[PDB]
Design a protein around this ligand. Sequence first.
Ligand SMILES: Nc1nc2c(ncn2[C@@H]2O[C@@H]3COP(=O)(O)O[C@H]4[C@@H](O)[C@H](n5cnc6c(N)ncnc65)O[C@@H]4COP(=O)(O)O[C@@H]2[C@@H]3O)c(=O)[nH]1
Ligand SMILES: [Zn+2]
Length: 355
Amino acid sequence: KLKKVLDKLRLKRKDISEAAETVNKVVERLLRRMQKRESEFKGVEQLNTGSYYEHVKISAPNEFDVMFKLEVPRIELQEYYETGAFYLVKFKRGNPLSHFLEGEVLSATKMLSKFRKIIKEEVKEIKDIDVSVEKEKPGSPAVTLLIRNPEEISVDIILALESKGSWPISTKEGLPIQGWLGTKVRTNLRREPFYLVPKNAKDGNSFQGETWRLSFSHTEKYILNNHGIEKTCCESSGAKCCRKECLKLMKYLLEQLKKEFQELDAFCSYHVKTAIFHMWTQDPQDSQWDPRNLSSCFDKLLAFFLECLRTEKLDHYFIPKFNLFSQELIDRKSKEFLSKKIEYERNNGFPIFDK
DNA sequence: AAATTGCCGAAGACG
DNA sequence: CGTCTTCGGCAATT
Ligand SMILES: Nc1nc2c(ncn2[C@@H]2O[C@@H]3COP(=O)(O)O[C@H]4[C@@H](O)[C@H](n5cnc6c(N)ncnc65)O[C@@H]4COP(=O)(O)O[C@@H]2[C@@H]3O)c(=O)[nH]1
Ligand SMILES: [Zn+2]
């Protein structure tokens, strides 16, 4: 049954070819524009991120996430209150970024506005492809493209500051992978740079326009590609596990529920991905994720998610004091609403999987 | 030093 | 299952 759902969720090679060809053409053109010439974003490099490049994209290849990352040396971070995730950026000259300053502080809003303006002008010159820039979203770090290939494809272009220093201390007790992927992996991952994206902290019913947010799309991608306690997990001379399949089933469940209940707008795939990371830490043995145990693994994930929902607590995997299910982010009656919907599908063999 | 190229793992496709 | 194929990612090369 779950097996038949996964077959339905599996992407088609022909759809992947058509979508990728068009997406890569458009992105490459955008990145080229950033490089040339008197652009403040001149040194940006591309990193592909999110569901599709993690191989956990379901149903259709119609959503692509890409980071344009700018190394900016000699920055000092100041934690915006005690959020753990949000920061203000200051500088340790006649530099490319001096006009994005709001006093001594590097403004996320200003920098993102220019970045978006450049993309809009470049997109206007694309004539062989039907692509447009979607309207700006409140507190989004993304410049979102809309492509008609003729099928609809969304591409999020995410500006990110790259910092080569050690990660901010709010992450010190995050990434608890020591009994799973191990201490050498954790240490090496934490020696990689960290990123800030111009997503603003929500302060009441407004946004703080200078704040940036930590991003670990890079570490997350590595983990999804290197997810076993055994090095050969899912390799050609190793054993297939069901970790990713279990994540797909969960994303699907949430996706289907979101399509018909508007009171679930505050929930998203990132909550599901965060939940399963915790599950992978809780159950690190590959033997616990044998494909023969898919049903029980999915049920265990469901139970864990319901418990996060009920206790109003889902710790960011990298920033443990940052609660994705705080009352401030998601109202209590939204969590109770999702709770009842999940229990129903769980007690009725997921009729919603039949669309 | 932008752009090309080699190399192969991940996973879809099909028997 | 095994074998084949395409795509993504990386960095040496020029
Ligand atoms: N592409 C992309 N979109 C993002 C990201 N963060 C947030 N968003 C979209 O930006 C709009 C405002 O974000 P919200 O905080 O209101 O809603 C998000 C956020 O709560 C959380 N979420 C999603 N992704 C993350 C990541 N990567 N880290 C931490 N929290 C995350 O859940 C909601 C998910 O909805 P979303 O598709 O992200 O839409 C957000 C809103 O459009 C981002 O990093 N990358
Ligand atoms: Zn595996």
